[PDB]
Amino acid sequence: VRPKSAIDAVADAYTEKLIELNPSFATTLGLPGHETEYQDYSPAGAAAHAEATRLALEALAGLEPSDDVDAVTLDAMRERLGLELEIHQSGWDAADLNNIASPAQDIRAIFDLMPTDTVEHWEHIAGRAANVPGAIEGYIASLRAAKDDRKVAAARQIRIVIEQTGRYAAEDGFFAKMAADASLGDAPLPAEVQDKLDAGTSAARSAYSALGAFLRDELLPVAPEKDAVGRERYSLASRSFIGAEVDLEETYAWGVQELERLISEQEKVAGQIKPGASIEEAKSILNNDPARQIKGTDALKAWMQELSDRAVSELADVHFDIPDVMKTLECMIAPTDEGGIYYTGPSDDFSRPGRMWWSVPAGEDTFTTWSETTTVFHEGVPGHHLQVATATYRRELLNNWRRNVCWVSGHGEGWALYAEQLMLELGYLKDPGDHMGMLDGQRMRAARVVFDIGVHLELPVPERWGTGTWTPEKGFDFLKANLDISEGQLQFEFTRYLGWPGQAPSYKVGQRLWEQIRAELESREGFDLKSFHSKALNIGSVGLDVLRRALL
Numbered sequence: 001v002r003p004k005s006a007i008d009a010v011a012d013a014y015t016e017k018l019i020e021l022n023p024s025f026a027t028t029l030g031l032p033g034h035e036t037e038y039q040d041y042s043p044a045g046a047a048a049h050a051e052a053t054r055l056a057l058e059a060l061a062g063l064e065p066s067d068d069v070d071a072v073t074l075d076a077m078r079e080r081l082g083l084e085l086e087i088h089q090s091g092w093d094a095a096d097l098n099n100i101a102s103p104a105q106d107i108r109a110i111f112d113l114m115p116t117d118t119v120e121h122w123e124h125i126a127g128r129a130a131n132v133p134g135a136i137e138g139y140i141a142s143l144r145a146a147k148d149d150r151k152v153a154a155a156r157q158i159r160i161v162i163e164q165t166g167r168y169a170a171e172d173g174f175f176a177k178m179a180a181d182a183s184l185g186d187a188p189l190p191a192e193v194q195d196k197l198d199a200g201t202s203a204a205r206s207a208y209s210a211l212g213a214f215l216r217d218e219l220l221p222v223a224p225e226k227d228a229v230g231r232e233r234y235s236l237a238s239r240s241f242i243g244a245e246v247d248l249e250e251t252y253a254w255g256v257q258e259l260e261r262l263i264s265e266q267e268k269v270a271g272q273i274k275p276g277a278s279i280e281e282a283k284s285i286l287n288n289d290p291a292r293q294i295k296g297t298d299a300l301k302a303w304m305q306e307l308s309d310r311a312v313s314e315l316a317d318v319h320f321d322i323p324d325v326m327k328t329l330e331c332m333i334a335p336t337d338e339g340g341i342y343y344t345g346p347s348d349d350f351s352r353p354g355r356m357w358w359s360v361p362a363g364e365d366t367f368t369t370w371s372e373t374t375t376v377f378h379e380g381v382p383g384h385h386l387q388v389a390t391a392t393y394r395r396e397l398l399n400n401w402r403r404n405v406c407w408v409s410g411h412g413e414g415w416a417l418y419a420e421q422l423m424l425e426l427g428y429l430k431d432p433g434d435h436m437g438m439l440d441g442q443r444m445r446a447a448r449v450v451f452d453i454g455v456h457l458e459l460p461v462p463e464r465w466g467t468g469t470w471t472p473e474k475g476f477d478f479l480k481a482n483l484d485i486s487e488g489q490l491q492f493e494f495t496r497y498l499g500w501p502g503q504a505p506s507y508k509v510g511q512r513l514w515e516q517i518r519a520e521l522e523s524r525e526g527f528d529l530k531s532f533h534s535k536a537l538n539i540g541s542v543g544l545d546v547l548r549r550a551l552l
């Protein structure tokens with residue numbers, strides 16, 4: 001029963017404008033009306049977004065907060081929107097292209113959300129396919145304008161997007177298969193809608209082939225070879241992922257030291273698995289021990305479930321406030337192989353509980369759990385589930401901007417890392433195998449800090465990892481030493497960090513900042529850890545600067 005304020009009204013109106021400007025955002029919100037439409041990716045599209053943003057800030061400028069909730073809203077919006085305008089004004093937004101989260105991927109990805117149960121559904125898919133050309137044309141218009149302004153993505157990233165988009169457009173690629181395999185009730189589409197689908201998918205194929213040609217012929221020849229984006233671009237991207245403007249040299253130095261600590265810890269844990277064992281030697285023992293393997297998905301679900309239910313029942317009303325509807329975290333098998341464990345939060349009304357989904361790679365039916373205990377806490381309780389479910393629980397106290405728009409990577413990923421560290425400190429990882437798995441994920445995330453900042457700023461390589469200053473080649477060998485992952489995933493992560501600067505440290509740096517907030521509050525009389533967790537999580541997703549000011 002907290003009534004909406006004038007500030008919430010501005011926040012809600014801005015949200016409606018965002019929905020109006022980006023119809024893809026409405027479909028990803030479940031809002032009907034604009035199922036076939038894309039945002040305007042052209043420069044005029046970007047100017048319109050920026051203008052709406054500038055007008056929203058102006059509207060907020062003379063509005064005093066009516067309560068603490070308003071003050072957080074003002075702070076979060078001023079931070080997020082102000083940063084958005086700094087990035088737009090920098091000119092680099094127009095050049096946006098990378099291997100993972102840029103318009104070429106986004107324009108294709110939206111199709112995966114669309115239902116396929118009625119003729120009208122298939123008309124929507126066909127109609128969206130038929131709008132892929134205009135989306136791509138506007139995107140090419142922004143890339144071309146940035147190019148004329150001497151701002152072009154690294155050659156590596158352009159080459160990757162030419163590869164990815166050529167598969168989308170190929171004879172047997174995404175859009176072709178969409179039209180060829182379409183069904184309704186396990187039967188072919190009626191001919192009239194099928195023809196709409198064939199025409200639309202055909203246009204989508206041609207548009208992705210044109211982006212390919214443009215990239216190849218106009219952009220690639222002027223693309224820089226150098227991947228590093230440099231200090232000025234880096235600091236703005238870093239802010240986008242963390243919501244704090246960190247000291248980059250200081251953060252880099254912290255990350256190098258933190259990686260060294262985590263390796264030292266792994267060496268200690270190795271000796272707890274087998275006296276005097278190297279990390280690699282201990283890992284063969286864990287990975288070859290019949291006791292650390294589970295057979296079949298039923299037993300796997302049972303294992304996840306017990307861990308989750310135990311964490312809830314032990315932490316409830318001790319370290320966290322967990323309302324009854326949040327105590328359920330259903331552990332499940334992913335219908336598809338999303339390549340790891342993922343979390344889906346509860347419905348707004350809590351009729352669907354939070355769920356955790358383990359993706360089983362094709363043909364796999366035995367499961368090693370030592371490395372995934374920590375992941376259960378990260379993706380589940382007290383990580384993502386408590387954070388996401390608490391924000392959702394407090395939704396009546398949160399305007400639509402806060403609920404549906406404002407989201408900061410360092411905040412939510414930092415929290416899941418905080419959560420793993422808390423479970424270490426509370427004695428959940430005493431088994432050396434489980435401990436090792438936690439350290440592995442921390443080590444990989446500490447390596448991200450060193451790589452991202454070191455490479456993009458061309459900093460001195462730490463003597464443990466090389467000499468001179470960082471180059472992408474040196475960075476690749478460094479990742480290979482610190483990430484226990486497949487060859488193909490290593491190559492992907494490498495490419496990602498190079499093309500998406502600022503995001504990779506958001507995990508460990510988010511953890512650091514969360515821990516700094518808690519450490520400060522701990523210095524004071526009456527600190528109460530449960531009360532801290534409640535106040536913080538109630539706020540929802542905000543930048544780390546904003547969170548610190550809401551809490552200190």
Ligand SMILES: [Mg+2]
Nearest residue numbers: 253256257260
């Ligand atoms: Mg040192």
Ligand SMILES: [Mg+2]
Nearest residue numbers: 343379384416
């Ligand atoms: Mg996650």
